[PDB]
Amino acid sequence: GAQSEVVVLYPDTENKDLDEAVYQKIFLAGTIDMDWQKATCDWFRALPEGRYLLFNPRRDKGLSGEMSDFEHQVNWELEHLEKADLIIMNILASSKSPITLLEMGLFMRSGKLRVICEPGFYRYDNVRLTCARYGVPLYQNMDDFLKTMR
Amino acid sequence: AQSEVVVLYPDTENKDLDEAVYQKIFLAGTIDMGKSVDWQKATCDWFRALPEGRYLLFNPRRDKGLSGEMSDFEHQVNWELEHLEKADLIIMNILASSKSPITLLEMGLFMRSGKLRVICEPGFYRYDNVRLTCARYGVPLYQNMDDFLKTM
Ligand SMILES: [Cl-]
Ligand SMILES: [Cl-]
Numbered sequence: 125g126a127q128s129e130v131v132v133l134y135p136d137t138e139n140k141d142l143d144e145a146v147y148q149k150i151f152l153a154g155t156i157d158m159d160w161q162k163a164t165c166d167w168f169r170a171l172p173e174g175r176y177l178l179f180n181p182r183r184d185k186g187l188s189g190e191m192s193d194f195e196h197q198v199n200w201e202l203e204h205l206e207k208a209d210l211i212i213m214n215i216l217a218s219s220k221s222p223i224t225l226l227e228m229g230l231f232m233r234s235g236k237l238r239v240i241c242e243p244g245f246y247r248y249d250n251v252r253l254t255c256a257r258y259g260v261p262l263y264q265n266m267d268d269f270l271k272t273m274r
Numbered sequence: 275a276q277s278e279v280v281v282l283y284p285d286t287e288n289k290d291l292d293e294a295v296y297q298k299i300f301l302a303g304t305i306d307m308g309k310s311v312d313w314q315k316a317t318c319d320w321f322r323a324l325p326e327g328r329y330l331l332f333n334p335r336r337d338k339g340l341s342g343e344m345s346d347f348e349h350q351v352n353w354e355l356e357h358l359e360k361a362d363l364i365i366m367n368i369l370a371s372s373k374s375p376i377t378l379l380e381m382g383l384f385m386r387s388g389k390l391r392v393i394c395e396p397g398f399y400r401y402d403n404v405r406l407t408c409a410r411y412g413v414p415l416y417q418n419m420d421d422f423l424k425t426m
Binding site: 191194195198199202220221222223225226227228229230231232247249250253254257 | 344347348351352355373374375376378379380381382383384385400402403406407410
């Protein structure tokens with residue numbers, strides 16, 4: 125059965141007195157549709173081993189639109205993209221994902237970025253050509269990528 | 275007393291030119307294939323009006339739009355990424371009306387380079403993301419080209 129330990133961190137949740145050093149820290153970057161993020165968390169929960177700390181920027185309820193809340197969201201995203209051991213970036217064909225592409229550029233040369241970009245995405249060839257140039261692993265679906273991790 | 279300005283496009287070649295003796299500037303940002311919003315030409319003309327200097331401007335905006343043929347498109351992206359890397363300075367101008375998704379990819383790519391200058395017009399649909407990210411990584415952010423070009 126499932127034996128992995130999975131802790132999920134959200135921008136609007138706090139897990140005080142947790143040692144982030146003993147976990148594999150994974151940032152779930154990509155399309156926010158108000159939910160591949162929950163299915164990815166469930167996938168890690170189903171694993172037979174490991175300690176995972178997943179940084180999920182997708183809140184259960186959408187943003188209010190209030191400025192200080194928005195700044196908290198962007199700063200939470202950038203701080204946890206930096207803290208992550210691995211960035212799982214999933215881009216759906218239906219999305220425009222403009223800030224996902226900003227984040228992709230930011231962590232393109234980090235060595236910890238894994239891009240999953242669905243064919244049909246309106247800027248797919250840009251993503252393919254840029255990842256090729258900088259040697260970033262590029263997958264077409266989450267099944268192919270998540271097999272590379274058991 | 276006039277400046278020397280050479281403009282290099284994805285569909286042009288200046289093979290008898292030593293790029294090492296020029297200040298290389300990449301014109302990143304909004305590409306509008308309308309006669310009115312050609313800010314890249316106006317920027318090139320601004321450099322041409324200077325009384326001194328040697329400037330090599332990498333302009334990714336072609337006079338005619340892309341055909342949509344795949345090898346032509348790949349040439350465009352590879353030309354952009356190569357000349358973004360070669361540039362001494364990246365002038366990135368983002369107009370309020372634009373969606374500029376590849377401009378934001380390029381901004382992320384050269385965010386920590388120290389050679390990126392961002393001009394982002396208020397009203398741009400992802401302005402606060404640009405403002406907050408530039409603030410975090412210490413990238414100069416301007417609201418218009420006039421304010422930025424005075425700092426040259
Ligand atoms: Cl959200
Ligand atoms: Cl073009």
